[PDB]
Amino acid sequence: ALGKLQDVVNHNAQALNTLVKQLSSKFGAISSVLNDIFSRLDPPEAEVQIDRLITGRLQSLQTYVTQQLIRAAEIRASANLAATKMSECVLGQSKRVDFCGKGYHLMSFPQSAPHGVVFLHVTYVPAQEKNFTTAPAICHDGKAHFPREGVFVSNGTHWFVTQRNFYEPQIITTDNTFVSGNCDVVIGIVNNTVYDP
Amino acid sequence: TMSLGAENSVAYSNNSIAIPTNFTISVTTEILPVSMTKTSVDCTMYICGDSTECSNLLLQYGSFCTQLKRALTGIAVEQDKNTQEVFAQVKQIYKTPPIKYFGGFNFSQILPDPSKPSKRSPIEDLLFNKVTRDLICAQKFKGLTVLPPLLTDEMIAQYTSALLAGTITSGWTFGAGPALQIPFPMQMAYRFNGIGVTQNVLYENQKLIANQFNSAIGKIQDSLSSTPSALGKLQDVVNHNAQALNTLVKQLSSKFGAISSVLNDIFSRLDPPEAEVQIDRLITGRLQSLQTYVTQQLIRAAEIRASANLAATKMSECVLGQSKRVDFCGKGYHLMSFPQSAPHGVVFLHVTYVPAQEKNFTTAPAICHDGKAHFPREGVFVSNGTHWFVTQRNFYEPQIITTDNTFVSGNCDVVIGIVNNTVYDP
Amino acid sequence: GTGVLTESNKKFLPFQQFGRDIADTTDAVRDPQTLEILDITPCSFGGVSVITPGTNTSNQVAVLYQGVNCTEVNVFQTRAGCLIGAEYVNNSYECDIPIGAGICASYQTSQSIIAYTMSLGAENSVAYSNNSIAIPTNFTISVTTEILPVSMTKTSVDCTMYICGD
Numbered sequence: 197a198l199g200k201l202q203d204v205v206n207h208n209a210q211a212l213n214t215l216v217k218q219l220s221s222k223f224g225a226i227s228s229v230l231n232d233i234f235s236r237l238d239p240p241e242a243e244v245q246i247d248r249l250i251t252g253r254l255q256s257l258q259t260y261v262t263q264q265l266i267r268a269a270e271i272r273a274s275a276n277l278a279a280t281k282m283s284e285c286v287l288g289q290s291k292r293v294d295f296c297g298k299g300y301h302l303m304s305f306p307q308s309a310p311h312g313v314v315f316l317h318v319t320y321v322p323a324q325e326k327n328f329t330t331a332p333a334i335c336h337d338g339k340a341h342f343p344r345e346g347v348f349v350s351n352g353t354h355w356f357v358t359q360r361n362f363y364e365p366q367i368i369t370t371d372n373t374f375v376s377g378n379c380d381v382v383i384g385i386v387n388n389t390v391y392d393p
Numbered sequence: 394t395m396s397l398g399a400e401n402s403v404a405y406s407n408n409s410i411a412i413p414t415n416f417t418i419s420v421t422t423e424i425l426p427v428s429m430t431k432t433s434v435d436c437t438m439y440i441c442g443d444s445t446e447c448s449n450l451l452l453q454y455g456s457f458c459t460q461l462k463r464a465l466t467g468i469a470v471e472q473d474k475n476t477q478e479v480f481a482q483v484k485q486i487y488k489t490p491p492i493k494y495f496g497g498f499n500f501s502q503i504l505p506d507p508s509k510p511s512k513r514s515p516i517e518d519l520l521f522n523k524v525t526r527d528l529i530c531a532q533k534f535k536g537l538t539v540l541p542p543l544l545t546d547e548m549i550a551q552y553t554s555a556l557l558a559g560t561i562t563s564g565w566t567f568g569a570g571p572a573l574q575i576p577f578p579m580q581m582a583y584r585f586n587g588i589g590v591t592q593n594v595l596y597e598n599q600k601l602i603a604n605q606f607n608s609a610i611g612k613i614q615d616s617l618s619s620t621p622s623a624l625g626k627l628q629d630v631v632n633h634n635a636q637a638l639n640t641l642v643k644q645l646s647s648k649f650g651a652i653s654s655v656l657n658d659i660f661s662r663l664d665p666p667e668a669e670v671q672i673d674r675l676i677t678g679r680l681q682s683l684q685t686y687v688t689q690q691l692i693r694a695a696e697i698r699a700s701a702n703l704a705a706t707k708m709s710e711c712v713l714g715q716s717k718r719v720d721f722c723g724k725g726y727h728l729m730s731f732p733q734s735a736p737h738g739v740v741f742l743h744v745t746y747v748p749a750q751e752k753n754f755t756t757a758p759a760i761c762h763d764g765k766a767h768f769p770r771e772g773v774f775v776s777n778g779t780h781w782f783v784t785q786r787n788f789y790e791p792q793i794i795t796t797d798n799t800f801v802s803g804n805c806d807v808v809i810g811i812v813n814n815t816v817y818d819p
Numbered sequence: 820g821t822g823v824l825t826e827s828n829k830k831f832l833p834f835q836q837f838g839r840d841i842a843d844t845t846d847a848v849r850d851p852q853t854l855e856i857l858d859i860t861p862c863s864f865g866g867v868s869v870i871t872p873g874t875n876t877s878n879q880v881a882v883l884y885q886g887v888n889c890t891e892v893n894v895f896q897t898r899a900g901c902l903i904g905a906e907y908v909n910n911s912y913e914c915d916i917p918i919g920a921g922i923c924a925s926y927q928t929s930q931s932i933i934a935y936t937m938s939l940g941a942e943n944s945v946a947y948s949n950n951s952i953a954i955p956t957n958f959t960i961s962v963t964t965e966i967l968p969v970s971m972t973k974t975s976v977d978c979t980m981y982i983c984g985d
């Protein structure tokens with residue numbers, strides 16, 4: 197589960213272990229021990245054999261720094277995303293899908309972690325859906341009535357208006373339905389009766 | 394001297410407002426690399442060419458024959474995760490219904506075609522045709538090979554067909570939770586409602602918006618083809634890899650201080666103690682050339698991962714839901730997005746609401762009636778010269794000022810620029 | 820050097836003995852004692868990829884060759900190479916070990932390393948009608964988790980002790 201927090205640890209361990217093992221590899225020299233080269237040789241030749249190791253170790257140390265620069269950019273990218281997900285998910289309710297958890301984002305709780313952070317996204321996932329008959333508008337006296345906030349549903353016999361994310365029927369009234377034009381242009385309009393308080 | 398565009402001068406007054414009277418649905422394209430070409434090198438073929446003594450001296454060096462392969466392996470897995478985090482944002486593979494009548498829209502170029510034996514949409518046919526001893530075999534005989542991707546073009550095609558069969562038949566309810574069916578005419582009415590416009594514009598102009606949409610998809614088929622360089626950012630990632638692999642096979646014939654570049658000639662003219670001196674010049678040099686390739690591939694994978702993560706965001710915020718981020722999902726008021734597969738990338742077809750045919754009016758912050766101010770609840774107070782009406786902000790719709798769209802908060806002595814009128818009450 | 824010696828269909832002019840490629844490597848040569856033209860091609864090579872469920876369940880392993888058509892090494896030939904050690908089953912499941920080209924291997928049931936085509940999930944056709952909307956009746960509050968790294972371990976090397984040790 198905390199696999200992407202151990203990957204940065206394993207990469208750093210692998211980097212700190214691939215750099216020390218090269219201290220026992222003859223980079224074209226007679227031996228890896230510096231004392232053996234300085235002892236069992238003469239000054240002019242020793243300055244040639246010690247030159248093949250001082251160069252093969254500078255390339256290894258430079259390889260470590262280059263790899264630590266490309267890897268830090270990956271960490272900086274994950275750090276900017278974590279900072280963004282601690283302000284859009286924690287410091288407020290985001291409306292970006294899949295950004296703060298899968299589903300409708302409600303809230304999030306940040307928790308510390310070794311060399312990282314763990315978000316707990318509380319999401320809103322609907323369930324137990326059904327099947328209803330819908331309609332764009334409803335003609336009552338000649339003009340079309342569109343849902344102000346909701347969707348027109350029908351249970352086979354009657355017509356109601358419910359929310360778009362939770363079933364809650366209410367009688368159709370003139371307080372949640374606005375009129376716009378006549379019943380001649382809307383394709384799929386049904387005939388019903390709107391209530392007036 | 395390059396011009397920065399035309400010099401337009403937008404008029405600015407105290408009582409002037411420009412409300413558009415029409416709309417122009419435009420479908421743009423967006424190209425983004427989501428993958429690369431997984432490569433694998435061999436230490437005992439690039440450094441040592443068919444030589445047995447060279448393999449002995451290569452083991453005498455450090456660990457530069459397993460950290461390079463492990464680094465290229467991490468790239469390969471990374472290029473297999475980018476295509477698994479973007480085209481696999483849905484668990485279920487939704488399918489299109491047999492009857493294809495979505496209110497009047499013609500989803501015939503983005504939906505897969507059963508006739509051709511490849512299960513690709515008409516738009517996804519010119520994308521795979523423009524983005525394309527030979528060189529592919531010459532590099533193989535030098536130790537440089539190419540690994541086949543995990544997800545084939547067939548699996549990516551049906552992956553883009555599940556994100557396109559739920560966006561049209563379920564809307565944005567198939568990325569959050571359970572896929573909820575909804576008629577498409579009622580889907581373009583809740584997407585037209587998240588841009589300020591009301592839903593009484595679509596139901597009164599459905600045939601017009603259906604013709605503009607069909608006329609905008611038919612141009613994408615021609616735009617991508619007619620354009621000299623349209624799928625160029627998908628070819629730059631291919632040319633960069635077709636250049637680093639060619640700049641690496643050309644360093645096997647460049648001596649770095651030896652008598653020649655052929656390893657089979659240094660051992661046939663020199664005994665074995667001067668050879669070891671001249672072979673470390675054709676091994677250490679070739680090790681740095683192979684290391685420079687891996688170093689540039691890591692920087693290359695860092696640019697593809699950024700575009701891959703950006704593609705995952707534009708396929709979960711433009712396709713799995715309507716976004717309110719300007720310039721993010723196209724150019725304009727975002728309405729829909731259809732993912733189109735492509736070689737080592739994806740093509741986003743953003744549908745943007747673009748207002749047009751704007752006309753000037755006379756605006757006012759609030760109106761005064763019965764000794765109290767009236768502010769617009771949702772809209773703007775415009776005037777045609779003699780009468781005052783309340784209209785929307787993204788579309789013109791003259792409506793009388795009733796006591797159902799104005800709230801009274803304050804008096805007519807605090808707002809600067811308050812006109813006088815008669816607030817009708819029902 | 821090593822390699823396979825086969826006849827060539829080239830048109831070597833009678834003043835050219837050797838022959839190179841786009842990598843400046845001998846791809847052809849003229850035999851002096853017969854005056855012919857051979858096509859020097861490198862002997863068969865490739866890669867080895869061992870598939871292992873782990874040394875916690877069993878010791879059975881599958882050998883995946885790269886670049887072979889099962890004729891230059893239960894045998895299976897995929898687009899990546901010859902997979903020797905696994906059988907290709909028909910019913911598809913979720914991927915367990917990525918082999919390539921849409922093929923994965925798992926240690927399922929007897930216990931042997933089976934091979935199958937990747938399954939991108941189940942199929943769920945959404946009934947689309949002209950007036951049919953699905954409104955949810957209940958809610959299910961869920962809590963997920965996202966493990967994002969923030970920082971890495973800081974390091975500092977001695978450039979006078981690592982290179983020269985005492």
Ligand SMILES: *[C@@H]1O[C@H](CO)[C@@H](O)[C@H](O)[C@H]1NC(C)=O
Binds near residue numbers: 351352353354
């Ligand atoms: C529809 O709902 C109304 C009000 O609850 C009820 O009286 C009627 O019987 C329902 N019809 C069906 C078939 O469910």
Ligand SMILES: *[C@@H]1O[C@H](CO)[C@@H](O)[C@H](O)[C@H]1NC(C)=O
Binds near residue numbers: 335386387
């Ligand atoms: C609906 O009303 C229209 C206009 O009055 C009328 O033409 C039509 O017959 C009505 N349909 C039904 C089903 O009542």
Ligand SMILES: *[C@@H]1O[C@H](CO)[C@@H](O)[C@H](O)[C@H]1NC(C)=O
Binds near residue numbers: 407
């Ligand atoms: C708005 O009114 C102020 C004060 O009369 C005036 O100075 C300003 O120029 C006006 N702006 C325009 C261009 O209508």
Ligand SMILES: *[C@@H]1O[C@H](CO)[C@@H](O)[C@H](O)[C@H]1NC(C)=O
Binds near residue numbers: 414415416750
């Ligand atoms: C809006 O633009 C379309 C396309 O140009 C045109 O067919 C239609 O007549 C225009 N409608 C208005 C309100 O002018």
Ligand SMILES: *[C@@H]1O[C@H](CO)[C@@H](O)[C@H](O)[C@H]1NC(C)=O
Binds near residue numbers: 499501
């Ligand atoms: C959709 O467009 C294609 C290509 O122009 C055409 O062949 C087809 O008849 C159109 N379908 C509909 C229903 O308009």
Ligand SMILES: *[C@@H]1O[C@H](CO)[C@@H](O)[C@H](O)[C@H]1NC(C)=O
Binds near residue numbers: 778
């Ligand atoms: C302004 O609108 C009113 C009501 O529609 C109309 O009677 C009047 O003639 C219009 N005047 C102009 C100048 O358009």
Ligand SMILES: *[C@@H]1O[C@H](CO)[C@@H](O)[C@H](O)[C@H]1NC(C)=O
Binds near residue numbers: 761
């Ligand atoms: C509105 O009416 C008041 C009271 O008659 C008057 O003082 C004010 O100047 C009027 N304003 C306008 C815009 O005519």
Ligand SMILES: *[C@@H]1O[C@H](CO)[C@@H](O)[C@H](O)[C@H]1NC(C)=O
Binds near residue numbers: 853
């Ligand atoms: C010797 O070489 C010449 C030139 O290739 C060839 O014509 C001749 O047949 C060869 N003779 C033998 C003994 O192989």
Ligand SMILES: *[C@@H]1O[C@H](CO)[C@@H](O)[C@H](O)[C@H]1NC(C)=O
Binds near residue numbers: 887888
């Ligand atoms: C392997 O050989 C068969 C011979 O029929 C051929 O059809 C197939 O394409 C070859 N595959 C590869 C990987 O070359």
Ligand SMILES: *[C@@H]1O[C@H](CO)[C@@H](O)[C@H](O)[C@H]1NC(C)=O
Binds near residue numbers: 492494948
């Ligand atoms: C919707 O109406 C059209 C035109 O009558 C028809 O072709 C289509 O099959 C209908 N769809 C369904 C399943 O209601």
Ligand SMILES: *[C@@H]1O[C@H](CO)[C@@H](O)[C@H](O)[C@H]1NC(C)=O
Binds near residue numbers: 956958
């Ligand atoms: C909603 O789901 C919860 C958890 O399964 C259950 O306890 C509750 O009774 C359900 N309520 C409805 C409206 O069915």
